[PDB]
Amino acid sequence: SEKIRVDIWSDIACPWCYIGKRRFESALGQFPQRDQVEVVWHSFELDPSARPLNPIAMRDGLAMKYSISPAQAQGSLDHMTQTAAQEGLEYHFDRVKLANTFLAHQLIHYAAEQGQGDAMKERLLRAYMSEGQNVNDLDTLQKLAAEVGLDAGAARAALEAGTYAQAVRYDEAQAQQLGITGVPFFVLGGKYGVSGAQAPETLLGALSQVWAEQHPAPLTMLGQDAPAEGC
């Protein structure tokens, strides 16, 4: 259709996803046919059974998850912080609120129907990673929606009603069916997979490949046209 679809699975709570988003955006900016690219965000939860708000420090949450020392958990946080800084991202992990992200993914689904999925995903990533906001908190979500330019009242109502809950679950089931067990995860043209926060060069190469495959060089035609059948 001369369009390239890029489906990206991601969690708001995953620091590699925000890094991955920037790296993809860098690829996209270098891609000549970038206007033909359609980006769709899909919901993914690192921990769908996470309590509404877990009060512990992100470092301790990480140390528990990966069974490591606090010093090593910190080293890991520091690595992600340094890496993010290279993408123009200023993380503040010391302020992170370890919230269940189900309602936040629902908001992105709401936003997407208004054509603002990416701006909503972006806002929520910054709120979580940099601004110490609780993305499980309805007032907070309502505020973030407003800042994205959405109908704040209607967004809140959609959230309170659970309108997009089942769509989020379907996104997550679709990831499982695809063998997607980690994020960020990129799907291009519904055909190619790219796992993790890959370099811009890798993602640019993927876009180019798919574009090239969907635009073979014209054939040189030989002879007359003989009996054939079309649609």
mmCIF file of C-alpha atoms in Angstrom:
data_model
loop_
_atom_site.group_PDB
_atom_site.id
_atom_site.type_symbol
_atom_site.label_atom_id
_atom_site.label_comp_id
_atom_site.label_asym_id
_atom_site.label_seq_id
_atom_site.Cartn_x
_atom_site.Cartn_y
_atom_site.Cartn_z
ATOM 1 C CA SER A 1 0.000 0.000 0.000
ATOM 2 C CA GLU A 2 3.166 2.140 -0.165
ATOM 3 C CA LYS A 3 2.887 2.458 3.605
ATOM 4 C CA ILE A 4 5.173 0.803 6.145
ATOM 5 C CA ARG A 5 3.579 -0.239 9.423
ATOM 6 C CA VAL A 6 5.760 -0.308 12.513
ATOM 7 C CA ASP A 7 4.150 -1.979 15.519
ATOM 8 C CA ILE A 8 6.020 -1.369 18.727
ATOM 9 C CA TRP A 9 5.352 -3.221 21.998
ATOM 10 C CA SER A 10 6.431 -1.313 25.083
ATOM 11 C CA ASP A 11 5.872 -0.720 28.795
ATOM 12 C CA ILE A 12 5.824 2.741 30.384
ATOM 13 C CA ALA A 13 7.801 1.259 33.292
ATOM 14 C CA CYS A 14 10.682 0.013 31.130
ATOM 15 C CA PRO A 15 13.649 2.404 30.879
ATOM 16 C CA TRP A 16 14.900 0.618 27.744
ATOM 17 C CA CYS A 17 11.624 1.471 26.019
ATOM 18 C CA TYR A 18 12.145 5.229 26.309
ATOM 19 C CA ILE A 19 15.725 4.790 25.044
ATOM 20 C CA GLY A 20 14.369 2.569 22.257
ATOM 21 C CA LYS A 21 11.765 5.172 21.279
ATOM 22 C CA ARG A 22 14.470 7.831 20.822
ATOM 23 C CA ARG A 23 16.704 5.481 18.864
ATOM 24 C CA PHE A 24 13.801 4.557 16.605
ATOM 25 C CA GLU A 25 12.971 8.236 16.178
ATOM 26 C CA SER A 26 16.580 8.859 15.114
ATOM 27 C CA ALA A 27 16.288 6.057 12.539
ATOM 28 C CA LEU A 28 13.005 7.521 11.326
ATOM 29 C CA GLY A 29 14.530 10.986 10.928
ATOM 30 C CA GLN A 30 17.247 9.500 8.680
ATOM 31 C CA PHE A 31 14.730 7.504 6.592
ATOM 32 C CA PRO A 32 13.852 9.283 3.326
ATOM 33 C CA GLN A 33 10.359 7.737 3.128
ATOM 34 C CA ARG A 34 9.561 8.542 6.776
ATOM 35 C CA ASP A 35 6.224 10.131 5.785
ATOM 36 C CA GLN A 36 5.061 6.711 4.574
ATOM 37 C CA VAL A 37 5.701 5.110 7.959
ATOM 38 C CA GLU A 38 2.806 4.359 10.304
ATOM 39 C CA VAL A 39 3.782 3.854 13.949
ATOM 40 C CA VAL A 40 1.386 2.035 16.290
ATOM 41 C CA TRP A 41 2.104 1.528 19.976
ATOM 42 C CA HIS A 42 0.961 -1.694 21.636
ATOM 43 C CA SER A 43 0.561 -2.352 25.348
ATOM 44 C CA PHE A 44 2.975 -4.544 27.288
ATOM 45 C CA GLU A 45 3.358 -4.926 31.070
ATOM 46 C CA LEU A 46 6.614 -6.124 32.647
ATOM 47 C CA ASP A 47 4.484 -7.079 35.646
ATOM 48 C CA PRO A 48 0.722 -7.164 35.031
ATOM 49 C CA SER A 49 0.136 -8.411 38.588
ATOM 50 C CA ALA A 50 2.060 -5.467 40.106
ATOM 51 C CA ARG A 51 0.245 -3.808 43.010
ATOM 52 C CA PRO A 52 -1.355 -0.387 42.246
ATOM 53 C CA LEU A 53 1.587 1.376 43.871
ATOM 54 C CA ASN A 54 4.676 -0.353 45.317
ATOM 55 C CA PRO A 55 6.307 2.123 47.746
ATOM 56 C CA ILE A 56 9.885 0.816 47.591
ATOM 57 C CA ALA A 57 12.824 2.467 45.825
ATOM 58 C CA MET A 58 13.327 1.530 42.187
ATOM 59 C CA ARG A 59 16.807 0.243 43.058
ATOM 60 C CA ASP A 60 15.375 -2.203 45.587
ATOM 61 C CA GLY A 61 12.622 -3.238 43.190
ATOM 62 C CA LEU A 62 15.253 -4.017 40.561
ATOM 63 C CA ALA A 63 17.499 -5.827 43.075
ATOM 64 C CA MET A 64 14.559 -8.060 44.000
ATOM 65 C CA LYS A 65 13.601 -8.736 40.391
ATOM 66 C CA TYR A 66 17.104 -9.789 39.314
ATOM 67 C CA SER A 67 18.376 -11.173 42.644
ATOM 68 C CA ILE A 68 21.413 -8.884 42.888
ATOM 69 C CA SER A 69 23.033 -6.595 45.464
ATOM 70 C CA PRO A 70 21.768 -3.029 45.936
ATOM 71 C CA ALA A 71 25.204 -1.851 44.737
ATOM 72 C CA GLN A 72 24.811 -3.770 41.488
ATOM 73 C CA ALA A 73 21.191 -2.677 41.073
ATOM 74 C CA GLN A 74 22.439 0.887 41.428
ATOM 75 C CA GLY A 75 25.156 0.202 38.845
ATOM 76 C CA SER A 76 22.430 -0.954 36.483
ATOM 77 C CA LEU A 77 20.305 2.129 37.181
ATOM 78 C CA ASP A 78 23.388 4.272 36.608
ATOM 79 C CA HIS A 79 24.044 2.550 33.250
ATOM 80 C CA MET A 80 20.498 3.151 32.048
ATOM 81 C CA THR A 81 20.689 6.751 33.240
ATOM 82 C CA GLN A 82 23.975 7.360 31.373
ATOM 83 C CA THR A 83 22.714 5.645 28.221
ATOM 84 C CA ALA A 84 19.463 7.625 28.322
ATOM 85 C CA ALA A 85 21.414 10.888 28.696
ATOM 86 C CA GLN A 86 22.976 10.201 25.281
ATOM 87 C CA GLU A 87 19.424 10.220 23.833
ATOM 88 C CA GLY A 88 18.684 13.591 25.460
ATOM 89 C CA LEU A 89 16.773 11.864 28.284
ATOM 90 C CA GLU A 90 17.300 12.952 31.891
ATOM 91 C CA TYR A 91 16.142 10.094 34.108
ATOM 92 C CA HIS A 92 15.467 10.450 37.835
ATOM 93 C CA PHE A 93 15.242 6.859 39.103
ATOM 94 C CA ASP A 94 15.487 8.006 42.738
ATOM 95 C CA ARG A 95 12.005 9.555 42.242
ATOM 96 C CA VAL A 96 10.404 6.703 40.316
ATOM 97 C CA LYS A 97 7.030 5.499 41.611
ATOM 98 C CA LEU A 98 6.714 1.773 41.021
ATOM 99 C CA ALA A 99 3.138 1.804 39.753
ATOM 100 C CA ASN A 100 1.012 -0.755 37.967
ATOM 101 C CA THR A 101 0.850 0.571 34.391
ATOM 102 C CA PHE A 102 -2.463 -1.014 33.275
ATOM 103 C CA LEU A 103 -4.516 2.215 33.510
ATOM 104 C CA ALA A 104 -1.746 4.209 31.834
ATOM 105 C CA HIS A 105 -1.766 1.808 28.849
ATOM 106 C CA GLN A 106 -5.524 2.284 28.722
ATOM 107 C CA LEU A 107 -4.966 6.037 28.411
ATOM 108 C CA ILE A 108 -2.627 5.486 25.467
ATOM 109 C CA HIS A 109 -5.381 3.444 23.827
ATOM 110 C CA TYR A 110 -7.768 6.347 24.434
ATOM 111 C CA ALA A 111 -5.299 8.823 22.972
ATOM 112 C CA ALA A 112 -4.644 6.653 19.911
ATOM 113 C CA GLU A 113 -8.298 6.897 18.881
ATOM 114 C CA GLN A 114 -7.803 10.657 18.879
ATOM 115 C CA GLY A 115 -4.640 10.165 16.818
ATOM 116 C CA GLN A 116 -2.373 11.096 19.735
ATOM 117 C CA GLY A 117 -1.033 7.693 20.734
ATOM 118 C CA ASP A 118 2.611 8.638 20.333
ATOM 119 C CA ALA A 119 2.345 11.964 22.189
ATOM 120 C CA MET A 120 0.540 10.176 25.030
ATOM 121 C CA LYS A 121 3.164 7.375 25.161
ATOM 122 C CA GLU A 122 5.915 10.033 25.179
ATOM 123 C CA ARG A 123 4.239 12.047 27.980
ATOM 124 C CA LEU A 124 3.752 8.980 30.137
ATOM 125 C CA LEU A 125 7.341 7.808 29.640
ATOM 126 C CA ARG A 126 8.646 11.184 30.759
ATOM 127 C CA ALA A 127 6.224 11.353 33.710
ATOM 128 C CA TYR A 128 7.420 7.934 34.919
ATOM 129 C CA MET A 129 11.164 8.065 34.243
ATOM 130 C CA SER A 130 11.942 11.736 34.829
ATOM 131 C CA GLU A 131 9.175 13.452 36.812
ATOM 132 C CA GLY A 132 8.476 10.983 39.622
ATOM 133 C CA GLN A 133 4.778 10.851 38.723
ATOM 134 C CA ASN A 134 2.488 7.982 39.786
ATOM 135 C CA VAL A 135 0.997 6.722 36.523
ATOM 136 C CA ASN A 136 -1.530 4.503 38.402
ATOM 137 C CA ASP A 137 -3.092 7.635 39.916
ATOM 138 C CA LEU A 138 -6.226 8.834 38.093
ATOM 139 C CA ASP A 139 -5.796 12.544 38.823
ATOM 140 C CA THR A 140 -2.241 12.266 37.505
ATOM 141 C CA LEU A 141 -3.373 10.445 34.354
ATOM 142 C CA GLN A 142 -6.137 12.984 33.818
ATOM 143 C CA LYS A 143 -3.606 15.822 34.100
ATOM 144 C CA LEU A 144 -1.186 14.165 31.644
ATOM 145 C CA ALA A 145 -4.041 13.671 29.160
ATOM 146 C CA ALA A 146 -4.840 17.386 29.411
ATOM 147 C CA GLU A 147 -1.219 18.328 28.768
ATOM 148 C CA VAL A 148 -1.235 16.145 25.623
ATOM 149 C CA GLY A 149 -4.222 18.182 24.431
ATOM 150 C CA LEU A 150 -6.861 15.552 25.086
ATOM 151 C CA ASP A 151 -10.351 15.993 26.491
ATOM 152 C CA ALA A 152 -9.364 15.630 30.147
ATOM 153 C CA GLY A 153 -12.868 14.890 31.400
ATOM 154 C CA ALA A 154 -13.592 12.342 28.683
ATOM 155 C CA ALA A 155 -10.206 10.676 29.201
ATOM 156 C CA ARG A 156 -10.833 10.306 32.952
ATOM 157 C CA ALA A 157 -14.305 8.899 32.298
ATOM 158 C CA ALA A 158 -12.914 6.355 29.834
ATOM 159 C CA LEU A 159 -10.363 5.334 32.467
ATOM 160 C CA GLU A 160 -12.910 5.108 35.304
ATOM 161 C CA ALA A 161 -15.157 2.997 33.064
ATOM 162 C CA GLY A 162 -12.347 0.650 31.980
ATOM 163 C CA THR A 163 -13.294 1.181 28.352
ATOM 164 C CA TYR A 164 -9.893 0.229 26.904
ATOM 165 C CA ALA A 165 -8.996 -2.423 29.496
ATOM 166 C CA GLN A 166 -9.785 -5.359 27.265
ATOM 167 C CA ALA A 167 -7.914 -3.815 24.296
ATOM 168 C CA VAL A 168 -4.818 -3.526 26.496
ATOM 169 C CA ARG A 169 -5.141 -7.222 27.423
ATOM 170 C CA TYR A 170 -5.511 -8.099 23.739
ATOM 171 C CA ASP A 171 -2.283 -6.179 22.983
ATOM 172 C CA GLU A 172 -0.557 -8.211 25.690
ATOM 173 C CA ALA A 173 -1.976 -11.510 24.450
ATOM 174 C CA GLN A 174 -0.905 -10.640 20.920
ATOM 175 C CA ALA A 175 2.649 -10.125 22.210
ATOM 176 C CA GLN A 176 2.619 -13.535 23.864
ATOM 177 C CA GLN A 177 1.314 -15.181 20.691
ATOM 178 C CA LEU A 178 4.164 -13.529 18.761
ATOM 179 C CA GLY A 179 6.783 -14.836 21.174
ATOM 180 C CA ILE A 180 7.462 -11.302 22.391
ATOM 181 C CA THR A 181 8.743 -11.794 25.941
ATOM 182 C CA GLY A 182 10.703 -8.556 26.292
ATOM 183 C CA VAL A 183 10.449 -4.871 25.409
ATOM 184 C CA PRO A 184 10.919 -2.702 23.443
ATOM 185 C CA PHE A 185 10.016 -4.903 20.485
ATOM 186 C CA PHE A 186 9.580 -3.655 16.934
ATOM 187 C CA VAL A 187 7.547 -5.272 14.162
ATOM 188 C CA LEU A 188 7.952 -3.916 10.629
ATOM 189 C CA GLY A 189 5.500 -4.573 7.813
ATOM 190 C CA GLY A 190 3.900 -7.255 9.978
ATOM 191 C CA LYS A 191 6.812 -9.421 8.883
ATOM 192 C CA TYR A 192 10.114 -8.513 10.527
ATOM 193 C CA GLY A 193 10.966 -8.459 14.204
ATOM 194 C CA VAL A 194 13.554 -6.346 15.974
ATOM 195 C CA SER A 195 14.102 -7.112 19.665
ATOM 196 C CA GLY A 196 15.301 -4.588 22.211
ATOM 197 C CA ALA A 197 16.472 -0.991 22.018
ATOM 198 C CA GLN A 198 18.544 -1.401 18.854
ATOM 199 C CA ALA A 199 20.886 1.183 17.368
ATOM 200 C CA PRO A 200 19.345 3.704 14.950
ATOM 201 C CA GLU A 201 21.468 2.157 12.197
ATOM 202 C CA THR A 202 19.799 -1.224 12.706
ATOM 203 C CA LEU A 203 16.277 0.200 12.653
ATOM 204 C CA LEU A 204 17.097 2.414 9.662
ATOM 205 C CA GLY A 205 18.405 -0.675 7.872
ATOM 206 C CA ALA A 206 15.154 -2.473 8.626
ATOM 207 C CA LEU A 207 12.964 0.373 7.323
ATOM 208 C CA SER A 208 15.084 0.580 4.163
ATOM 209 C CA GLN A 209 14.914 -3.171 3.612
ATOM 210 C CA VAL A 210 11.131 -3.264 3.914
ATOM 211 C CA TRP A 211 10.722 -0.249 1.658
ATOM 212 C CA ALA A 212 13.086 -1.819 -0.873
ATOM 213 C CA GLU A 213 11.158 -5.111 -0.782
ATOM 214 C CA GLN A 214 7.856 -3.321 -1.386
ATOM 215 C CA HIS A 215 9.316 -1.465 -4.375
ATOM 216 C CA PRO A 216 11.119 -3.844 -6.718
ATOM 217 C CA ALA A 217 12.624 -2.293 -9.842
ATOM 218 C CA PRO A 218 10.252 -2.303 -12.843
ATOM 219 C CA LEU A 219 10.652 -5.310 -15.127
ATOM 220 C CA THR A 220 11.735 -4.949 -18.732
ATOM 221 C CA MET A 221 8.839 -6.384 -20.734
ATOM 222 C CA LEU A 222 9.539 -8.748 -23.617
ATOM 223 C CA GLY A 223 7.261 -9.628 -26.536
ATOM 224 C CA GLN A 224 3.557 -8.977 -27.081
ATOM 225 C CA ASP A 225 0.892 -9.569 -24.435
ATOM 226 C CA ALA A 226 -0.451 -13.123 -24.712
ATOM 227 C CA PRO A 227 -3.599 -14.761 -23.256
ATOM 228 C CA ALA A 228 -3.848 -14.118 -19.545
ATOM 229 C CA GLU A 229 -6.415 -13.795 -16.766
ATOM 230 C CA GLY A 230 -6.554 -11.126 -14.073
ATOM 231 C CA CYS A 231 -8.866 -10.314 -11.173
#
